[PDB]
Structure formats: C-alpha cells, structure tokens
Amino acid sequence: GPHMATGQDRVVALVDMDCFFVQVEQRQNPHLRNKPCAVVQYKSWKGGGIIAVSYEARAFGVTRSMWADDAKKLCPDLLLAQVRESRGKANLTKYREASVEVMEIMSRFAVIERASIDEAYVDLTSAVQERLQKLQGQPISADLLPSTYIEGLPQGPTVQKEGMRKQGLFQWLDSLQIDNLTSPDLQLTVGAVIVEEMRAAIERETGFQCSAGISHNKVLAKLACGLNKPNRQTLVSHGSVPQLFSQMPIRKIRSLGGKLGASVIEILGIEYMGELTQFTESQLQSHFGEKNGSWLYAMCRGIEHDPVKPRQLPKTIGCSKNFPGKTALATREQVQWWLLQLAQELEERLTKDRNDNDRVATQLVVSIRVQGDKRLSSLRRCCALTRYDAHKMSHDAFTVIKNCNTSGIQTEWSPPLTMLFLCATKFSAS
DNA sequence: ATTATGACGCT
DNA sequence: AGCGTCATA
Ligand SMILES: [Mg+2]
Ligand SMILES: [Mn+2]
Ligand SMILES: [Mn+2]
Hints:
It is classed as replication, transferase/dna. By secondary structure, the chain is of the alpha+beta class. The protein has helices at 20-28, 55-58, 68-74, 93-106, 125-134, 161-175, 184-206, 218-227, 241-246, 259-268, 281-288, 290-299, 332-357, 390-401, and strands at residues 12-17, 37-41, 49-53, 79-82, 85-86, 89-90, 112-116, 119-123, 148-150, 210-215, 233-235, 317-322, 329-331, 359-370, 379-384, 412-429. The chain folds into four domains: 1-18 and 89-249, Reverse transcriptase/Diguanylate cyclase domain (Alpha-Beta Plaits), CATH 3.30.70.270; 19-88, MutS, DNA mismatch repair protein, domain I, CATH 3.40.1170; 250-307, Orthogonal Bundle (DNA polymerase, domain 1), CATH 1.10.150; 308-430, DNA polymerase, Y-family, little finger domain (Dna Ligase, domain 1), CATH 3.30.1490.100. The structure holds a DNA duplex.
C-alpha cells in the first residue's frame, strides 16, 4: 500500500529539435523555408543519401535513408541542401555548432544531458520546486501552456486538432490540486510551464523549433516528445501510463528497438509494453538478465531511475568514412592518404575542443572494416594520443593497422578496406 | 552503396 | 581492452 514506489520523484524533460539539419539549412537559406526539403550527403551515387526531411516533404513519403533520386520520384519539387565536404568527406561542423547554440540556451534553465546532436534531457525537479514556491498556490492558466498536449485527454462524456488539444488541457487543469506542493501531477504541469519557456527561448534566440516531452523519467519523456511533433510538447503523467502502454509496441521504447525488444516479444509471446506487467520480476530476470529484468519490471509500470547525467559535451570526438563497393581502398598510398584526411579533420576538431572546453584527449582509437565483413567494425585498436598533430596521428593509426594487410606484396592492401575510423577519447582536464 | 557519428554494456 | 548493441541527423 503505502510502500509501493511509484517513480514520481523527479520531473524530467526531453527536448528534441524538429527536422534539425533541415532547420539549420532553412535558417541559412530562406528560399528553403516552408518547403518540401531534405538534407543529403554526397551526390554522385543516386543523388546522395537523405539524412533529414522537412515535415512538408514527409507528407509525400520522403524519409531518411532514401536516395535523393528516389525521393524525387515521390516529390518532384523536393528541395535539397548538401552537407559540406572537406578533405574528401562529409563534414558535420555546421550542425555540431548549431547544436551547441541550443544546448547553451537549455543549460540556462537546468543541468542537461546531451543525448544526441539534436536533443537533451533536463532534470527540472529543483526548478519546479522553486517555481512552485513563488507561485503562491495560484492556479496554472491554460495561457501558460499554449503548445502543450496532455496525453490521454480529453476523455469521457470539436473536430479541429487545436480544439482537441485545448479540451484535453482544460480537463487536466480543471482536475489539478494546486494546493499540494508535493503532488506529482502538479509538479509535471509546472515542469511543462518551464519547458514552454525553454522552447520559446530556443526559438527566439536561434530560429529553430523543437518538440518536448515532460514526464517523471527519461524513457517516458522521450516517448512523450514524439507523440505530438513538430513544434509541440506533451505531458505524460504517471496515471496515463496504463492506457498509453496498453497498445504501445514494445519496440517504441528506448533501448527495446533492437534484438532485446525482439526477444521480449518472441520469448513472452506479447506485443505491447503493458503486457509486461503480468510477469514477475524474477521471470523477467530469468529471460533477459538481472539488470534488464528489473528495468523491464519497473519500466512497464512507468518507472525508471536512470539519472539525467550532467554532461553537455560529447566525451569522444571521431571521424569516419565508408568506402563502399568499388571505392574500397586497395593500396597503401590510398589507405595512408585517407588516414591523413581523417586525421586532419580530427586535429582541427580536437584543437577547437581544447581551446573551448579546457580538456585534452589522451587515447586514439583506430577502427577499420574489411570487404566481406558482415559487421560495422572488423577491427578496433587503441594507441596513445600525445600530440594534436594530424601527421603523427595518421602515422600512428597506420602502425596499428599495418598487419591487417593480407597481401604478400606491401604496396597493395588486401582485403580492401571499406571503412576507416579515427576516434579521440579519454579526456583529461587541461 | 545509407553514412557519420556517439553512448554504454559485456567479458 | 576489443567487441557488440542501440541510438540519432
Ligand atoms: Mg529522427
Ligand atoms: Mn529531432
Ligand atoms: Mn533526436
């Protein structure tokens, strides 16, 4: 009864930019605004590979991973922006720098966890307590929540979408008990008020729109965020979880989109997150391991304890290039030239990082893929990173991979390399 | 011939 | 350490 922990102690948000690389290009080039458009890398093979798609273009069925030539078949007027190429490779610097713009604004409200190039988690628990105490037990007006959806509402005893949003929000606000500063639903609501302010700040100061989820933990916040994209935010309350999860495919929950999620489905013969509640913690641990089992047992009840880590900066800096089909590297001079290209971009990014962030990387990881290999990486080797010098880093990388060459001849490289990867890791303050 | 990343888990 | 999983533009 009184001891049943409910995963209501925190207020957590996830803020995720809408169509992020597309918005970065639309800010730069006004001709692309409010149009079906996509961001592409490379051009020569099938028009290039799409990595971001505006919502206008999604209406035509354009998706990520699509070749631009194929996307053009669905959407003949599709506009395209190309990722920068430097030193023979795609260069994502413009988007990394746009990410920093957003992360710095978010950091003004609370400590954030950078979760990708375009999203961060926010622990709003403390901020919510402070806003609650200056609120003086005064009700929260719908006007403070102009882009907020309350998941699961309206319900019970208008055919426009905004009309439905407000009806749900009205039901929610009508039910609230603003008299209780410890009420989780109230805390989430004030959390949502703060996230409206955060999202307004991001749009004002960068031009970029975003969506957000507000709940009691990271997994629910992430799930919530996607429910009403673009340019809206969604509150998923603890009470909303049973209905939400009753028809929620297991794969939709973060970390269950791959082999583990498939195994949950196959082994237990279920489809939806809610169905997990009928297994004991020990049953789930028996199939999926101690850690996953306990996590699943709590997660299907809406409960998760993973903290929002205080980390705003990436903890690795890497450079990678595929060499597909007939472009695979088959000579020593080829392999060395591309290690140099990668190492030169890595040095540029590392030196910037050292100046900006007062740290130095101490380990260099080198990874390659060989033709025929089923996997992402065929081989990974580390060595010391002692100087921010591209020629040394590329020479060192070659030394660690030198023996992968199976050719008797040393001038040729076999089997040909289909991927090179340089990653700087193990930072120390400097 | 999706590509370029980046975090974290396992042994 | 090196490998595997899962994730996002
Ligand atoms: Mg996406
Ligand atoms: Mn996004
Ligand atoms: Mn994202």
